[PDB]
Amino acid sequence: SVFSERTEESSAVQYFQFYGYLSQQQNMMQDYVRTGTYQRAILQNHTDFKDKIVLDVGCGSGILSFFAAQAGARKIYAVEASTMAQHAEVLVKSNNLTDRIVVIPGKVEEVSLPEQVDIIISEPMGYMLFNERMLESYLHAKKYLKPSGNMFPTIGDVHLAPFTDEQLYMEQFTKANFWYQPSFHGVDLSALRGAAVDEYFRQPVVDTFDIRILMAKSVKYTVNFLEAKEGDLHRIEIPFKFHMLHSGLVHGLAFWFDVAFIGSIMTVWLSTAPTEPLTHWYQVRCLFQSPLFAKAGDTLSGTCLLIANKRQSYDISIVAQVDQTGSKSSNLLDLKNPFFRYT
Amino acid sequence: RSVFSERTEESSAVQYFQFYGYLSQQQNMMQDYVRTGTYQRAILQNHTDFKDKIVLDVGCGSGILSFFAAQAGARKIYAVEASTMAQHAEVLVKSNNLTDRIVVIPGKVEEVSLPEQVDIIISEPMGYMLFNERMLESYLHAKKYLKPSGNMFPTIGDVHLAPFTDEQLYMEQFTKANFWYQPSFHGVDLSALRGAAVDEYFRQPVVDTFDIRILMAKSVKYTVNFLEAKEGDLHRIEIPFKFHMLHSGLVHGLAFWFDVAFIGSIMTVWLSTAPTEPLTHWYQVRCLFQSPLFAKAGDTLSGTCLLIANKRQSYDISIVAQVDQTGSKSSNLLDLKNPFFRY
Amino acid sequence: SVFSERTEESSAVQYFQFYGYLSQQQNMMQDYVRTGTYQRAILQNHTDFKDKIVLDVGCGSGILSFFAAQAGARKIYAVEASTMAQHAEVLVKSNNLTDRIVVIPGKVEEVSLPEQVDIIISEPMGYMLFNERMLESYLHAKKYLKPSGNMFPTIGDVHLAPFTDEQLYMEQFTKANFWYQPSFHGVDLSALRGAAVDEYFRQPVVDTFDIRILMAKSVKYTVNFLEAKEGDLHRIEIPFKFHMLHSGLVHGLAFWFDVAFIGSIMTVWLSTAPTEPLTHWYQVRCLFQSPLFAKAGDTLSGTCLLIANKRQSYDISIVAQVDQTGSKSSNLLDLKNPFFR
Amino acid sequence: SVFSERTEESSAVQYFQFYGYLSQQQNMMQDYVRTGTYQRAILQNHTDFKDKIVLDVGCGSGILSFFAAQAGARKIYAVEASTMAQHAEVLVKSNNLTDRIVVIPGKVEEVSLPEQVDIIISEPMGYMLFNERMLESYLHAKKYLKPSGNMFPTIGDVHLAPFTDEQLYMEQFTKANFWYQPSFHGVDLSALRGAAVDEYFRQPVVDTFDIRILMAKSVKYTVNFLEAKEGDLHRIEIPFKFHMLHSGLVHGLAFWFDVAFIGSIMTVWLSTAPTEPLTHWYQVRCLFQSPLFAKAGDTLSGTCLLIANKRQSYDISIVAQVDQTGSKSSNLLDLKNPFFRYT
Ligand SMILES: NC(=[NH2+])NCC[C@H]1O[C@@H](n2cnc3c(N)ncnc32)[C@H](O)[C@@H]1O
Ligand SMILES: NC(=[NH2+])NCC[C@H]1O[C@@H](n2cnc3c(N)ncnc32)[C@H](O)[C@@H]1O
Ligand SMILES: NC(=[NH2+])NCC[C@H]1O[C@@H](n2cnc3c(N)ncnc32)[C@H](O)[C@@H]1O
Ligand SMILES: NC(=[NH2+])NCC[C@H]1O[C@@H](n2cnc3c(N)ncnc32)[C@H](O)[C@@H]1O
């Protein structure tokens, strides 16, 4: 299948084992920004669901399938590949909805639906939006969407902006310099110091930050879920030209995302920006190997290239340059293994 | 057809060795001065056991233990490591000018081919509750390369268990599961999964430290002699116990820690993770009862701790506890692979 | 009679036995807030008693009748159905007020009075105000009240407000976990865990608390004793709509009450709010079996429904929901069986 | 019936409402002394239950019937008059003992049991042993007992001892002196002080105390449950002659009780003595209206006369004299309404 073609068995076993735990469902369900906003998007656009046929890609416990029911849906197909599907079935029965919700265990790339649907709902966003590569399953599910169909969420905006954080940058060499000692119990470790540094800079940093560290208006890369195909996400090239508002050293790029539910009654937004209440997605920062000096008025131009990998994530390639000086930096990051720095 | 692959799901093995390929994880283990300092003491203080001898280091990681044997005069050390950390070991061997003595042999100890039998095997195979990761079986499997006159460092391993009281910990876990009693979470009835939630939450071993005064009886000890034991002995580990209660109150579970002894020719050096000893990165492990048991001072608490090795490099743990006077009984299952790090 | 029709004899026996004890009269009288405020309301409004006919419903030891005598009342009929009525007569004689205070033994729904009165006085408030159902006896007595007569107290305000208090929550959940044991002395009790949680959470929690646990401004439900008819208190439906001020878990609703003595000279208030000095009424809190979550700005809507029962108390029904999310909590309470904490 | 002829209906309604609460069953079941001893006496005398027919009088939740089944009883009739019987039926079904335990809802004086039983078990002791007058229901059930049957408990002993507690005696007047003031908000209350004093003295005090306040070895009155008839408890005249071990003022009499399970294998004792762990029965003390001075070696003689009343309790008539001096005091207490003083 398409899923197994793009995924190492080892990665998938652990991925779906992780999501079979109720404590993880509870974690996602207890994010009120997430759960609240989805419920509002669906209920405030009841006309997009009333008496319609719905598909819920990766329903977990089925919470989004119940909001669709509250909105007046006629039939909801809830697809879930982990063992959480067993618990979703229990909740459909205990809530007297077996007539309107059908739980289909399995991967959305492999199950079969009995009819086409009017709208697909899902929550496929990972870290930096794209982590987990579940947006490809969301788009893959469009093979069941009528030409009339809508997508909830409808679009996705990735935002990237240069930041300054001297203490975050310095923390990397503080940790790596453990290896730069010539007699750790009589053993000279210094030969591995460069490797340790490299390892730390290859981790995206997951936490939040004061918006004042940002040095320029963000650049926006949009994914239109109504028009995009799975292949469009195998290689995501994000060019950027930042016009610096403050002078200082740029230590990397900060990432966040928004999604919009574009309904017939209104559009509802779900934002993980550092200016909005915190969510379980936090924000993501990718450091440059060497900081770049820029002054207010200069331009910072380059590209952020995301290359999907068979571990359900992306290899990140960032190259940036101050146009007025030619000073250049880059970095390679493995989004699968981020550093969770939040306290 | 290797012994390792026959007892290990591929998915678990891949992630296991990816996890230990990280230098940041080597740092965490090496920076535990109790671990690294005691291992060096046991080796250097028993240098006669290593002078001009052949050594095998099972799971050398970065190679620290192999360096200790080189300091003690070992004639030749074979350092086996299956993760990509093996290549980092080689770098340290070259930069420390020990290429004539330390031979890194990459691969699994169940699959490599050593050129000769060895006088002594050294390893640090202890996980949480001693037995997690199932590396003791690889340690014992390596005895096929050990001369009949040889030794094991560590030589024996003691598992200690004792009953404890801690209502806050018990209520802390039951609090998390009350989420799934909700009759109307955003209008959805979750109560049907309250049973499934409590089972999942009370399947998690609690890894952290605690005050020794929560222990309500003298610990029971279960000893594994690594010189005598056979690989197959660790597929099923049955630990009966009978505690003489020193205090009255509620028994909320059993606490677990372990000691290992390096029984050398010059002296025996002990490495302990007991709560009366300085904290290590192993901490201590506590298994909770879903329903606490009451006992008075003078009563006896008896039962069995049974560990069944699973294909995911861990153990499924069943604990049955009974106060003999009243017949009050508590049966509990725990997934040692997925613990709650509470510290 | 009206009283016997709405009261199991079994309840009435114990009820009036309880109030026949001097020790229980000492308890109420030593509440200086209660006793001092009643005296202040009566004496400050002495013109509403000067040379007037008075009726004191459920006088107990007769303390309120003496206050009316101090204010110049010409004649005070003091009705008391327990044996305490004879103790009141002793005090009337020892204080040399036989010319002004006339103890009438019996239930106010069954005694005859020589004449009509100008003002009724009484202390009929119980826990959560309505417990004991004496407000109906207080209102029933209005058959003896002249037109345009006054009522002391004149009105009663009930205040509701959501609160957060996880300790009280898992405290009542702890007691209930005893019935989850699958082997108590070898016996599986778990089949009764549902009945245990229900029973334990039907008990109102009577105690005081810090005002900072309240999550919204209180909602007020007023009872006008001058206008209300006793039948109005058989089924009390109190709608509420709170505007949440803080985000967090709502573990239930807190109840207190104030009464106002609206006299000719002055309006005197007697409050049992948590912002005010504690009284023997304390405050009341009704726990949800499952807490509700709400963010600051959300609205919590529902109704508190009180159905009076034949045991001189009420069956309480509280249904509350977070309007934005549909999170709903339905809970029942037996006001007759409180938990003094 | 016999129950209704000796009980006022108002008293009966509140009595069985009280015991319909699970919270009250837990209160008695959580007394380890009560529940642990009953279990011990039944199991350690298993020969008195194996393949026998049993009657549990006032089973409550049925805990004692389960103990009887643990001992191997063939058939157990469990009689309970309150609505707790329906809960007992649930536990019988949930413990898979519907073939051994049959719950009979109703009063033991009124229900119809088909056959004679081999042994009757019950926990009918109240404050001072006799409060609640349930011992008469226990003896009344002997109409179903074979002539060779047994009773668990077999016998009951009530112990009387003189005590000194100046603080307790004075506490009465401090409370009653609230009324001895000429202007309480302008009201002379002093006319009711005598009535307040009398009221406090008619109340037995339920709480514990330090054994050191006892001034003589206790006097013991025994009820042999195999021999007694329920009519023997309508009027219980207990003559006492105490030999004073200490000199001082005697303020009243203290009461506790023991019961013994005289089985075929052994005799097990359940004590509520002040020298033993505290139970939910505490102890009881009745004050003299005037204290009596007695020297060590003197004798304090008199009678404690308990007269049953229609409120499932007793009126207590105590009369005491110092033989050597001729000083007398007495009191007449209402056991149905005690003063709970324990803190
Ligand atoms: N939104 C996230 N970042 N994570 C939630 C993913 C949820 O969708 C489920 N899921 C992920 N991929 C798939 C798929 N291809 N088919 C079905 N369910 C899936 C997964 O088991 C979990 O319940
Ligand atoms: N001491 C621990 N609890 N864990 C450390 C395990 C270390 O041994 C390595 N290791 C584990 N099992 C094996 C094996 N069968 N063969 C070789 N190396 C192994 C692993 O890669 C890591 O470096
Ligand atoms: N305020 C309270 N919570 N209780 C006060 C009740 C007092 O009034 C008396 N009382 C209660 N109901 C009645 C009644 N219907 N008629 C007369 N006295 C009554 C009761 O005996 C006690 O003295
Ligand atoms: N041991 C005590 N002091 N009290 C226990 C009283 C228990 O016996 C029950 N009980 C009391 N009298 C009777 C009776 N005549 N018939 C049946 N059950 C009774 C009562 O319902 C409660 O469960």
Short mmCIF file of C-alpha atoms in Angstrom, two decimals, chain A:
data_model
loop_
_atom_site.label_atom_id
_atom_site.label_comp_id
_atom_site.label_asym_id
_atom_site.label_seq_id
_atom_site.Cartn_x
_atom_site.Cartn_y
_atom_site.Cartn_z
CA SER A 1 0.00 0.00 0.00
CA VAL A 2 0.96 3.67 -0.25
CA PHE A 3 1.52 3.84 3.51
CA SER A 4 3.86 0.85 3.75
CA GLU A 5 5.67 2.00 0.60
CA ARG A 6 6.68 5.22 2.37
CA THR A 7 7.27 3.86 5.89
CA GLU A 8 9.74 1.53 7.57
CA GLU A 9 7.85 -1.23 9.39
CA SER A 10 9.93 -0.50 12.50
CA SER A 11 8.82 3.14 12.52
CA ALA A 12 5.14 2.28 12.02
CA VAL A 13 5.00 -0.37 14.76
CA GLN A 14 6.20 2.15 17.35
CA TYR A 15 4.09 4.98 15.93
CA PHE A 16 0.79 3.10 16.26
CA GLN A 17 1.86 1.47 19.53
CA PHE A 18 2.38 4.98 20.92
CA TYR A 19 -1.11 6.13 19.89
CA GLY A 20 -2.87 3.04 21.26
CA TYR A 21 -2.41 4.47 24.76
CA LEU A 22 -5.34 6.28 26.36
CA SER A 23 -2.94 8.59 28.21
CA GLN A 24 -1.86 9.99 24.84
CA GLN A 25 -5.46 10.47 23.71
CA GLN A 26 -6.13 12.19 27.04
CA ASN A 27 -3.10 14.42 26.46
CA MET A 28 -4.41 15.55 23.06
CA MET A 29 -8.01 15.77 24.28
CA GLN A 30 -7.00 17.93 27.26
CA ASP A 31 -5.46 20.56 24.95
CA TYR A 32 -8.43 22.92 25.07
CA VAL A 33 -7.20 25.09 22.19
CA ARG A 34 -7.15 21.97 20.02
CA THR A 35 -10.40 20.33 21.13
CA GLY A 36 -12.31 23.57 21.66
CA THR A 37 -11.44 25.08 18.29
CA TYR A 38 -12.29 21.93 16.32
CA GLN A 39 -15.66 21.72 18.08
CA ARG A 40 -16.36 25.38 17.30
CA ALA A 41 -15.27 25.00 13.67
CA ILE A 42 -17.64 22.06 13.19
CA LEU A 43 -20.61 23.33 15.20
CA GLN A 44 -20.51 26.93 13.95
CA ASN A 45 -20.53 25.51 10.40
CA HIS A 46 -23.39 23.08 11.03
CA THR A 47 -24.60 23.52 7.44
CA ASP A 48 -21.43 21.81 6.20
CA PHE A 49 -22.30 18.73 8.31
CA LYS A 50 -26.09 18.62 8.77
CA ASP A 51 -27.29 15.40 7.08
CA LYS A 52 -23.92 14.96 5.32
CA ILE A 53 -21.53 12.02 4.99
CA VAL A 54 -18.25 12.51 6.85
CA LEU A 55 -14.87 10.77 6.98
CA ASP A 56 -12.66 11.12 10.07
CA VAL A 57 -9.04 10.22 9.27
CA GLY A 58 -7.21 9.00 12.36
CA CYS A 59 -10.09 9.40 14.79
CA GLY A 60 -8.25 8.01 17.82
CA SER A 61 -10.97 7.74 20.45
CA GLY A 62 -13.47 9.28 17.99
CA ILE A 63 -13.93 12.72 19.54
CA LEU A 64 -14.04 14.50 16.17
CA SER A 65 -16.60 11.98 14.92
CA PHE A 66 -18.85 12.94 17.84
CA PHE A 67 -18.63 16.66 17.07
CA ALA A 68 -19.72 15.81 13.52
CA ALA A 69 -22.64 13.91 15.06
CA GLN A 70 -23.52 16.87 17.30
CA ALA A 71 -23.55 19.00 14.13
CA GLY A 72 -26.23 16.75 12.60
CA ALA A 73 -24.24 14.43 10.34
CA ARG A 74 -26.01 11.46 8.77
CA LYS A 75 -23.09 9.02 8.50
CA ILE A 76 -19.53 9.28 9.83
CA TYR A 77 -16.75 6.85 8.91
CA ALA A 78 -14.07 6.93 11.62
CA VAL A 79 -10.80 5.35 10.47
CA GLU A 80 -8.07 4.50 13.00
CA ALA A 81 -5.17 2.08 12.57
CA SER A 82 -4.00 1.69 16.18
CA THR A 83 -5.74 -0.41 18.84
CA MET A 84 -7.48 2.78 20.00
CA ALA A 85 -10.15 1.87 17.43
CA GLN A 86 -11.42 -0.76 19.88
CA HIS A 87 -12.01 2.00 22.44
CA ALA A 88 -13.63 4.26 19.84
CA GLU A 89 -16.11 1.47 19.10
CA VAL A 90 -16.89 1.17 22.82
CA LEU A 91 -17.63 4.90 23.00
CA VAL A 92 -19.87 4.83 19.92
CA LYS A 93 -21.95 2.09 21.54
CA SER A 94 -22.07 3.70 24.99
CA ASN A 95 -23.17 7.02 23.44
CA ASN A 96 -26.03 5.45 21.44
CA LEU A 97 -24.54 6.38 18.05
CA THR A 98 -23.92 2.99 16.37
CA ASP A 99 -26.47 4.04 13.74
CA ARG A 100 -24.52 7.16 12.69
CA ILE A 101 -20.83 6.33 13.31
CA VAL A 102 -19.01 3.33 11.82
CA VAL A 103 -15.52 2.63 13.17
CA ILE A 104 -13.24 1.12 10.53
CA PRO A 105 -10.02 -0.26 12.03
CA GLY A 106 -7.00 0.02 9.78
CA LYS A 107 -4.86 2.46 7.82
CA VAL A 108 -6.74 4.98 5.69
CA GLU A 109 -4.52 3.91 2.78
CA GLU A 110 -5.68 0.29 3.12
CA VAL A 111 -9.28 0.18 4.39
CA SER A 112 -12.23 0.46 2.00
CA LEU A 113 -15.19 2.80 2.43
CA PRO A 114 -18.66 1.78 1.18
CA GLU A 115 -19.50 5.19 -0.34
CA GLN A 116 -18.09 8.59 -1.16
CA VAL A 117 -18.21 11.31 1.49
CA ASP A 118 -19.16 14.99 1.47
CA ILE A 119 -16.38 16.21 3.79
CA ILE A 120 -13.21 14.91 5.45
CA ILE A 121 -12.30 15.92 8.99
CA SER A 122 -9.00 15.14 10.68
CA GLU A 123 -6.30 16.44 13.01
CA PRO A 124 -3.07 15.46 11.20
CA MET A 125 -0.78 18.28 12.39
CA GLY A 126 2.48 17.31 14.05
CA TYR A 127 5.44 19.35 15.21
CA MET A 128 6.27 21.98 12.58
CA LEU A 129 2.96 20.90 10.98
CA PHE A 130 4.58 18.17 8.87
CA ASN A 131 6.10 15.84 11.48
CA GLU A 132 4.60 12.32 11.39
CA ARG A 133 3.80 12.72 7.67
CA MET A 134 0.12 12.21 8.50
CA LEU A 135 -0.94 15.06 6.20
CA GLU A 136 -0.24 12.63 3.35
CA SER A 137 -2.86 10.26 4.80
CA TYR A 138 -5.26 13.20 5.08
CA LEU A 139 -4.69 14.06 1.41
CA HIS A 140 -4.72 10.38 0.41
CA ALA A 141 -8.23 10.14 1.85
CA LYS A 142 -9.42 12.54 -0.88
CA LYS A 143 -9.92 9.49 -3.11
CA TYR A 144 -13.22 9.15 -1.19
CA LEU A 145 -14.19 12.84 -1.39
CA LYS A 146 -16.95 13.92 -3.74
CA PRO A 147 -16.06 16.73 -6.18
CA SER A 148 -18.30 18.84 -3.92
CA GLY A 149 -16.31 17.97 -0.86
CA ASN A 150 -14.68 20.25 1.69
CA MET A 151 -11.70 19.67 3.98
CA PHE A 152 -11.64 20.42 7.72
CA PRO A 153 -9.02 21.85 8.14
CA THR A 154 -9.04 23.42 4.68
CA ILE A 155 -5.59 25.08 4.57
CA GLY A 156 -2.36 25.04 6.54
CA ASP A 157 0.07 27.93 7.00
CA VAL A 158 3.65 27.31 8.09
CA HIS A 159 5.36 30.40 9.52
CA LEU A 160 9.12 30.80 9.82
CA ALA A 161 10.98 33.78 11.23
CA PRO A 162 14.59 34.54 12.24
CA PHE A 163 15.22 34.74 15.98
CA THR A 164 18.01 35.68 18.37
CA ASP A 165 18.64 33.59 21.49
CA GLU A 166 22.26 33.74 22.64
CA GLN A 167 21.62 31.49 25.65
CA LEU A 168 19.94 28.77 23.58
CA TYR A 169 22.84 28.77 21.12
CA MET A 170 25.42 28.67 23.92
CA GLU A 171 23.62 25.81 25.70
CA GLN A 172 24.62 23.51 22.83
CA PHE A 173 28.37 23.86 23.36
CA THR A 174 27.94 23.70 27.14
CA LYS A 175 26.39 20.24 26.75
CA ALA A 176 28.81 19.07 24.06
CA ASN A 177 31.89 20.21 25.98
CA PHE A 178 31.39 17.24 28.32
CA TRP A 179 33.50 15.38 25.77
CA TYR A 180 36.26 18.03 25.70
CA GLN A 181 38.25 16.74 28.66
CA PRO A 182 41.54 14.82 28.35
CA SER A 183 41.12 12.58 31.43
CA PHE A 184 37.55 11.52 32.17
CA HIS A 185 38.51 8.71 34.56
CA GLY A 186 41.82 8.65 32.70
CA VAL A 187 40.23 8.70 29.22
CA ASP A 188 40.67 11.54 26.73
CA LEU A 189 37.22 12.11 25.22
CA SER A 190 38.01 15.26 23.22
CA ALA A 191 38.08 13.45 19.87
CA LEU A 192 34.26 13.05 19.96
CA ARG A 193 33.49 16.69 20.81
CA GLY A 194 32.79 17.69 17.21
CA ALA A 195 30.43 14.74 16.82
CA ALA A 196 28.55 15.69 19.99
CA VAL A 197 28.14 19.30 18.82
CA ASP A 198 26.87 18.10 15.44
CA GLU A 199 24.38 15.79 17.16
CA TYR A 200 22.93 18.59 19.30
CA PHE A 201 22.52 21.05 16.42
CA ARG A 202 20.72 18.36 14.39
CA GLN A 203 17.83 18.42 16.90
CA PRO A 204 14.92 20.84 16.44
CA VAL A 205 14.15 22.48 19.78
CA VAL A 206 10.55 22.13 20.97
CA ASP A 207 9.43 24.78 23.44
CA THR A 208 8.03 28.32 23.56
CA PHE A 209 9.65 31.74 23.64
CA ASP A 210 9.05 35.46 24.06
CA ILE A 211 7.98 37.03 20.77
CA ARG A 212 10.60 39.76 21.31
CA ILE A 213 13.35 37.36 20.18
CA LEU A 214 11.91 37.53 16.65
CA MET A 215 13.81 39.81 14.28
CA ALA A 216 11.52 40.08 11.23
CA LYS A 217 7.97 39.52 10.03
CA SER A 218 7.33 35.84 9.42
CA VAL A 219 7.22 34.24 5.97
CA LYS A 220 4.20 32.06 5.21
CA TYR A 221 4.08 28.79 3.26
CA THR A 222 0.54 27.59 2.56
CA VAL A 223 -0.78 24.10 1.88
CA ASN A 224 -4.26 24.04 0.34
CA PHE A 225 -5.68 20.66 1.37
CA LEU A 226 -8.40 20.93 -1.29
CA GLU A 227 -5.81 21.11 -4.10
CA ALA A 228 -2.62 19.45 -2.84
CA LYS A 229 -1.64 15.86 -3.58
CA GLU A 230 0.44 13.52 -1.43
CA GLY A 231 3.45 13.95 -3.71
CA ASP A 232 3.54 17.69 -3.03
CA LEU A 233 4.69 16.92 0.53
CA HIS A 234 7.60 14.59 -0.30
CA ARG A 235 9.69 17.70 -1.07
CA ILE A 236 8.71 21.02 0.52
CA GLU A 237 10.91 23.92 -0.63
CA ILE A 238 10.26 27.11 1.34
CA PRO A 239 12.21 30.13 0.05
CA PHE A 240 12.38 33.21 2.24
CA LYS A 241 13.64 36.79 2.15
CA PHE A 242 13.44 38.38 5.60
CA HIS A 243 13.62 42.16 5.98
CA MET A 244 15.28 42.63 9.36
CA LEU A 245 13.47 44.87 11.85
CA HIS A 246 16.17 44.67 14.54
CA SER A 247 19.95 44.47 14.49
CA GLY A 248 21.66 41.50 16.09
CA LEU A 249 22.87 37.95 15.67
CA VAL A 250 20.49 35.48 14.02
CA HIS A 251 20.83 32.06 15.65
CA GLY A 252 18.26 30.16 13.58
CA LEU A 253 14.66 30.00 12.41
CA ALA A 254 11.53 29.65 14.54
CA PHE A 255 8.56 27.68 13.21
CA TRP A 256 4.84 27.62 13.96
CA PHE A 257 1.68 26.96 11.99
CA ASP A 258 -1.98 27.87 11.67
CA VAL A 259 -4.86 26.00 10.05
CA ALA A 260 -8.21 27.34 8.91
CA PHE A 261 -11.59 25.61 8.69
CA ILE A 262 -13.20 27.40 5.74
CA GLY A 263 -16.92 26.67 6.12
CA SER A 264 -20.10 27.96 4.53
CA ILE A 265 -21.04 30.04 7.58
CA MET A 266 -17.60 31.23 8.73
CA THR A 267 -13.88 30.49 8.81
CA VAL A 268 -12.39 29.38 12.13
CA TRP A 269 -8.65 29.53 12.78
CA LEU A 270 -6.43 27.36 14.98
CA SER A 271 -3.07 29.05 15.59
CA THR A 272 0.03 27.79 17.39
CA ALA A 273 1.80 31.15 17.01
CA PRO A 274 3.91 32.41 19.94
CA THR A 275 1.34 35.23 20.29
CA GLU A 276 -1.48 32.77 21.03
CA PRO A 277 -2.22 30.50 24.01
CA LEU A 278 0.21 27.61 24.24
CA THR A 279 -0.72 24.22 22.77
CA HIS A 280 0.82 20.76 22.90
CA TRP A 281 2.54 21.66 19.61
CA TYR A 282 4.51 24.52 21.23
CA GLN A 283 6.83 26.12 18.66
CA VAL A 284 9.95 24.76 16.95
CA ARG A 285 13.36 26.38 16.51
CA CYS A 286 16.15 25.20 14.21
CA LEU A 287 19.54 26.67 15.06
CA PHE A 288 22.16 27.76 12.59
CA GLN A 289 25.58 26.18 13.04
CA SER A 290 27.10 29.68 13.04
CA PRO A 291 25.06 32.82 13.81
CA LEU A 292 24.71 35.53 11.18
CA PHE A 293 25.01 39.23 11.95
CA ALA A 294 22.31 41.39 10.37
CA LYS A 295 21.26 44.99 10.91
CA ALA A 296 17.86 46.66 10.70
CA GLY A 297 17.19 47.07 6.99
CA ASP A 298 19.30 44.16 5.74
CA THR A 299 17.76 41.14 4.02
CA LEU A 300 18.19 37.51 5.10
CA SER A 301 17.55 35.29 2.08
CA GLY A 302 17.67 31.53 1.66
CA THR A 303 15.58 28.38 1.53
CA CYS A 304 14.15 25.87 3.98
CA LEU A 305 13.99 22.46 2.29
CA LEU A 306 12.00 19.63 3.89
CA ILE A 307 12.70 16.13 2.53
CA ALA A 308 10.34 13.42 3.73
CA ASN A 309 11.93 10.22 5.05
CA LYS A 310 10.67 6.70 5.64
CA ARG A 311 10.67 7.29 9.43
CA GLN A 312 7.43 9.31 9.15
CA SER A 313 9.30 12.62 9.40
CA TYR A 314 11.56 14.99 7.46
CA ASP A 315 15.21 15.84 7.04
CA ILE A 316 15.45 19.63 7.32
CA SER A 317 17.94 21.60 5.22
CA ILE A 318 18.22 25.32 5.96
CA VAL A 319 20.62 27.70 4.20
CA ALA A 320 20.59 31.44 4.88
CA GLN A 321 22.67 34.43 3.85
CA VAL A 322 22.86 38.14 4.65
CA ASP A 323 22.61 39.71 1.20
CA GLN A 324 24.45 42.90 2.18
CA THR A 325 27.55 41.00 3.39
CA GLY A 326 27.53 37.50 1.87
CA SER A 327 27.84 35.95 5.33
CA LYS A 328 26.29 32.49 5.03
CA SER A 329 25.22 29.66 7.31
CA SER A 330 23.29 26.41 7.10
CA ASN A 331 22.29 23.34 9.10
CA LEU A 332 20.81 19.85 8.76
CA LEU A 333 18.19 18.75 11.27
CA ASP A 334 16.41 15.46 11.93
CA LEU A 335 12.82 16.35 12.81
CA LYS A 336 12.15 12.80 14.05
CA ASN A 337 14.36 13.32 17.14
CA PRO A 338 13.70 16.80 18.57
CA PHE A 339 14.90 18.17 21.89
CA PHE A 340 11.97 18.87 24.22
CA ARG A 341 13.33 21.87 26.12
CA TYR A 342 10.08 23.19 27.63
CA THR A 343 9.86 23.29 31.42
#
